[PDB]
């Protein structure tokens, strides 16, 4: 047989990237996964080269990053790629997840695939937070303070967990040094989880836009999708390039260009954009414990979809009510984000509370009710008795 098939290492490459049978009809929405692998690579490569010039000591962290910006040849390119790349990593992940939601990719037999994806998402959120703290600007310090404090809501031992995470009385040197060490580690655990994600993907293959079997017409990954992936890889790089070179700070916060100050929390504090919808959810609950529980639940509820989707067909392509409510969900999510960016003021507080309800109601109420109705509608519209 061909060497690409007989060799122990190459056969892995062959079965995953060359001869892998793909459903002929997958559209550009199926290009997000490769874009995520590419993002993972960009973050790791740029981070290692920057690590070479970074000092984690709380007295030197901020200046060491300014040093990368000013004295390291092409240093500003590495930092801007890393920072903007983190944002692009989230934009693409949301699209990858939204694609899954719409096409019923979380359904059987791809439940395991979906569950591993949820874990990767949590790990990615944690990794970006750890990195953000490494800059040690104002947003870094308070972000580290607020987020480590999330654990104080745990009854009895919560404050102990926090002092243990901090390594002291407050966010200090021990804190930033351990956060840099952890920021370096997690990306590699994410890489291992991505392999587990691809392993689950390989046993059942990709789904397609029609939601039905792809077994009657497959075409090899090699050539077709390798080159189709190339199209979005370049478009992705072009756009990332526009930000990196022409508008490098548009997706960040000006307060992070101010060294962290333990005695002053800026009135302008706002979480990173990709964390806003979650932040809004937490802010909507006027109770400490419940606020943090509801926020975490907003992520875990993604695990419920395989059970609450009662439909007998995979995906929303031929479902009128499901398509409509899917977009209600998407725009409701964007609203949650716009609320997160606003002040805790009158119209906003109530809107956030209602949007929060809509967020959970989608998975727990709307989908099971609507999918059941659609099931019945499909039946009575053709059975003549």
């Amino acid at each position: 047989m061909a060497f690409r098939k007989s060799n122990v290492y190459l056969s892995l490459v062959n079965s995953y990237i060359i001869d892998s049978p793909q459903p002929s009809s997958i559209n550009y929405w199926w290009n997000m996964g490769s874009l995520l692998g590419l993002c993972l690579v960009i973050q790791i490569v740029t981070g290692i080269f920057m690590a070479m010039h970074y000092s984690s000591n709380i007295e030197l962290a901020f200046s060491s990053v300014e040093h990368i910006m000013r004295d390291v040849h092409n240093g500003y390119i590495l930092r801007y790629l890393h920072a903007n790349g983190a944002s692009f990593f989230f934009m693409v992940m949301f699209m990858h997840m939204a694609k899954g939601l719409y096409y019923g990719s979380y359904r059987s037999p791809r439940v395991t695939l979906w569950n591993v994806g949820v874990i990767i998402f949590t790990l990615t959120i944690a990794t970006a937070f750890l990195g953000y703290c490494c800059v040690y600007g104002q947003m870094s310090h308070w972000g580290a303070t607020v987020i480590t404090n999330l654990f104080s809501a745990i009854p009895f031992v919560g404050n102990d967990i926090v002092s243990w995470l901090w390594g002291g009385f407050s966010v200090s040197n021990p804190t930033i040094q351990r956060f840099f060490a952890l920021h370096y580690l997690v990306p590699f655990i994410i890489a291992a989880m991505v392999i587990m994600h691809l392993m689950a993907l390989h046993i059942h293959g990709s789904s397609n836009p029609l939601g039905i079997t792809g077994n009657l017409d497959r075409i090899p990954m090699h050539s077709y999708f390798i080159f189709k992936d190339l199209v979005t890889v370049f478009l992705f790089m072009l756009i990332l390039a526009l930000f990196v070179f022409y508008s490098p700070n548009t997706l960040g916060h000006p307060d992070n260009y101010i060294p962290g100050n333990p005695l002053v929390t800026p009135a302008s504090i706002v979480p990173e954009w990709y964390l806003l919808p979650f932040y809004a959810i937490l802010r909507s609950i006027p109770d400490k414990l419940l606020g943090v529980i509801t926020m975490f639940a907003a992520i875990l509820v993604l695990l419920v979809l395989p059970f609450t989707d009662r439909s007998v067909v995979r995906g929303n392509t031929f479902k009128v009510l499901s398509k409509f409510f899917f977009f209600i969900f998407v725009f409701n999510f964007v609203l949650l984000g716009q609320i997160g960016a606003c002040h805790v003021e009158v119209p906003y507080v109530l809107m956030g509370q209602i949007a929060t309800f809509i967020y959970f109601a989608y998975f727990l109420i709307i989908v099971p009710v609507i999918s059941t109705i659609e099931n019945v509608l499909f039946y009575i519209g053709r059975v003549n008795k």
Partner: protein, 93 residues
């Protein structure tokens, strides 16, 4: 090798689909085809169709949310202006 669990996808020659019979396919080398330029005059008016059926599913939920957003915003602006400080004290705490 070690026994593998049954799945819903096989490989070339045993994909796991039903037995096919009666279907005949035809294709022509990309080399023999008219170089990319014909995607106009014939493939232009035909396009934009996969969004004329979908725009409503996107637009209506978008509209509802944009209106809802604009409204709450304009109301907040009023509340913090001179004209609305009276209403502010009322709806606030």
């Amino acid at each position: 090798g070690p026994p593998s669990g049954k799945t819903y996808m096989g490989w070339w020659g045993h994909m796991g689909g039903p037995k096919q019979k009666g279907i005949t396919s035809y294709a022509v080398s990309p080399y023999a085809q008219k170089p990319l330029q014909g995607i106009f005059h014939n493939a232009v008016f035909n396009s934009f169709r996969r969004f004329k059926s979908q725009f409503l599913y996107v637009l209506i939920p978008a509209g509802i949310y944009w209106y809802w957003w604009k409204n709450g915003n304009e109301y907040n602006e009023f509340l913090y202006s001179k004209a609305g400080r009276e209403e502010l004290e009322r709806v606030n705490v």
